[PDB]
Design a protein around this ligand. Structure first.
Ligand SMILES: COc1cccc(Cl)c1CC(=O)N1CCC[C@@H](C(N)=O)C1
Ligand SMILES: [Zn+2]
Length: 139
């Protein structure tokens, strides 16, 4: 679990969005596993606007943060799960690092701010849904 709170927006994994997220929907994209809902309170976070490929993510299944080197956002094949059929997930960044299904939502940060959230993983890999291209999160 986990979310980004920026301005009057909440960014979550689309597969973990609540009934309340859907009732306050701003934007969603199944191909990216992202959903953005509106909030009444002003949010706690800064979005990175950069091309970093190193950063630190929170891993809830270890209660720890780990440093990672990750690929640029790209179209990556993701096997079928209970939430989606087998498909290419777009704007995904992969790194070597521990993850389990419930780690989805953990934030990845660089020195500039929030880069994305855990969205996929397996066998010593962890995949992050990028949010740096969503310029409107800051408007
Ligand atoms: C961090 O996630 C994992 C880590 C290790 C192993 C596994 Cl099977 C997962 C779970 C996983 O990859 N899912 C969860 C559901 C939505 C999926 C998607 N984004 O298409 C991705
Ligand atoms: Zn950066």
């Amino acid at each position: 679990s986990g979310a980004i709170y920026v301005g009057n927006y909440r960014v979550v994994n689309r597969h973990l969005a609540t009934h309340n997220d859907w009732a306050n929907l701003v934007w969603e994209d199944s191909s990216r596993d992202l959903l953005v809902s509106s909030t009444t309170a002003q949010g706690c976070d800064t979005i990175a606007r950069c091309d970093c490929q190193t950063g630190v993510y929170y891993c809830s299944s270890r209660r720890k943060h780990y440093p990672v080197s990750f690929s640029k956002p790209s179209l990556i094949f993701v096997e079928a799960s209970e939430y989606y059929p087998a498909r290419y997930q777009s704007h995904l960044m992969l790194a070597v690092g521990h993850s389990e299904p419930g780690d989805c939502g953990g934030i990845l940060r660089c020195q500039h701010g929030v880069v994305g959230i855990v969205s996929t993983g397996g066998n010593g890999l962890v995949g992050f849904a990028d949010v740096r291209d969503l310029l409107w999160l800051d408007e």
